[PDB]
């Protein structure tokens with residue numbers, strides 16, 4: 001038996017629970033994973049009637065730590081967590097998974113240009129993409145959190161032609177949640193009265209917090225928040241500096257709240273979207289009606305029936321102020337894309353990307 | 361009392377958490393906010409207490425909470441003053457405590473922390489709800505809880521708890537493993553005594569899928585010598601792998617501890633918790649906090665379990681732990697109102 005860990009080796013499916021769902025998690029020994037795995041195990045993410053299996057992918061260097069995590073899960077006695085496995089080979093960890101939470105990625109190293117980060121992490125996702133294509137479920141949902149998200153996702157799906165491109169996601173939910181918080185604060189209202197908050201573009205400094213389509217208590221934010229300057233200059237920067245402001249305050253990563261956002265991101269795919277609302281997710285653009293370039297992964301407004309899939313939200317309004325920001329982010333993504341042409345199999349690479357675009 | 365966007369279904373319940381900027385809290389607070397602890401129909405309010413030395417860390421967590429958008433979390437506030445943070449609180453999760461300093465004798469820790477809970481005990485008495493449930497995690501737990509309730513006379517000595525649930529959960533896991541059964545088939549597991557190397561994992565009363573453990577696990581050599589030790593050294597086995605504290609799992613145990621108080625205990629089962637022992641039926645010393653088996657109707661309180669058998673193997677261990685507790689108690693008499701203090705406590709007993 002080499003597919004189970006400790007006490008989890010003793011289970012098997014006990015045929016009102018739904019069939020076991022398999023979830024792979026890269027960067028499994030990381031800080032975000034340390035907060036996320038327990039939320040999943042408790043059933044808060046997929047619901048109380050959904051038992052699950054956790055396939056944790058780590059590395060040779062962090063395998064020890066990976067064992068520590070599995071042991072803490074053993075001591076948590078979560079009744080919905082029926083299976084746990086750990087490993088360093090994605091062709092193994094990924095077999096039969098229905099979800100792939102790809103958090104693993106090399107941090108932006110000292111004096112490491114944007115291009116090198118695109119190539120180093122791109123290679124990692126190109127391989128994980130092949131692993132998923134060979135051993136994972138043909139309908140696996142792949143949620144990318146490892147930076148740079150959008151382009152890593154493009155690379156991943158391009159290396160998994162047998163998996164619908166539509167199934168790949170670059171998470172912008174944390175930034176959506178922060179934008180909504182900032183909006184709520186500004187309008188002096190609680191965050192449960194804010195909706196239709198969209199983050200367009202790639203997960204970087206060019207991301208677009210869209211206030212035009214947002215609502216506060218059912219009304220367009222523009223009629224509630226009159227301060228146009230804040231909306232067009234302060235809002236975005238406030239969102240953009242939140243992660244960085246939490247670095248000096250907290251001292252380190254804001255793991256807890258990003259794990260919360262990853263959970264929300266998943267729930268948005270497995271629960272029907274409340275009428276009129278939507279959620280943000282970096283997704284394959286081919287076919288989009290927003291006039292955005294095709295063949296890339298761009299965060300856009302989406303809603304879901306709760307079947308694990310989604311559709312782009314059409315009841316969206318667009319003005320030049322939004323359009324321009326959307327095309328600017330689009331351009332950065334087209335530049336990133338060409339820069340990884342080798343990994344996508346597009347042909348030959350050409351890199352000319354901005355250096356200070358990494359969201360703090 | 362509000363923070364950030366928070367400056368703007370059953371009756372709201374207020375929760376106070378000390379050591380709020382600590383690693384355990386960093387996991388626990390979000391479990392509480394999401395509603396996995398008190399349920400999806402229980403809106404809550406978090407009162408976060410931390411040390412001034414960690415106020416910035418406190419802000420960070422509060423900020424992460426605003427960014428989490430938990431709809432059940434209606435209020436959040438932070439501060440460094442117990443008389444402030446504890447006002448109207450229904451629950452007080454006391455995780456805050458000074459770690460065993462460099463070359464610090466067990467007696468020093470007792471005084472330093474005991475002095476902290478004595479003061480928090482007074483703050484609770486003065487401003488917290490009169491029926492506030494107090495769960496202690498700051499070590500020493502038992503002795504800190506005892507000191508806390510002695511300093512809060514207007515609050516039922518009944519409501520004070522020293523958490524051992526983590527050790528019970530670990531015990532249940534080790535029993536499930538050894539018996540080749542899943543951990544959800546193990547029950548009636550009790551951790552007796554003090555939260556320390558003197559704790560007593562009770563296998564005599566332990567059950568596995570409805571039948572006594574001794575009826576499934578035949579390796580007696582194990583039960584009698586290994587079992588208790590594996591549990592006792594689980595925290596150490598985790599620090600060698602993970603690298604640091606096991607915040608995540610203990611946060612889960614704390615959530616469980618609370619749920620055993622607000623959820624009807626399953627028939628015939630019970631949960632471990634260090635509590636006031638005066639009316640105890642097991643013949644264990646009184647006027648102290650000892651971990652015993654309890655059950656509850658899920659109304660916030662509990663009652664001891666009488667459907668427990670004992671033997672000399674078990675009872676002897678329960679006494680050695682009792683001896684340690686009495687020693688700790690005398691050592692902090694100046695904080696309980698027991699007159700003068702006398703310290704003759706063991707050094708290496710820390711889990």
Ligand SMILES: [Zn+2]
Nearest residue numbers: 012013020083
């Ligand atoms: Zn299975």
Ligand SMILES: [Zn+2]
Nearest residue numbers: 095096135136
């Ligand atoms: Zn397969």
Ligand SMILES: [Zn+2]
Nearest residue numbers: 145147149203
């Ligand atoms: Zn990203």
Ligand SMILES: [Zn+2]
Nearest residue numbers: 174175243359
């Ligand atoms: Zn971000």
Ligand SMILES: [Zn+2]
Nearest residue numbers: 228229232321
């Ligand atoms: Zn304008």
Ligand SMILES: [Zn+2]
Nearest residue numbers: 361444445447
């Ligand atoms: Zn106040």
Ligand SMILES: [Zn+2]
Nearest residue numbers: 497501523555
């Ligand atoms: Zn303790």
Ligand SMILES: [Zn+2]
Nearest residue numbers: 526527555711
């Ligand atoms: Zn312990």
Ligand SMILES: [Zn+2]
Nearest residue numbers: 646647648698
């Ligand atoms: Zn006494």
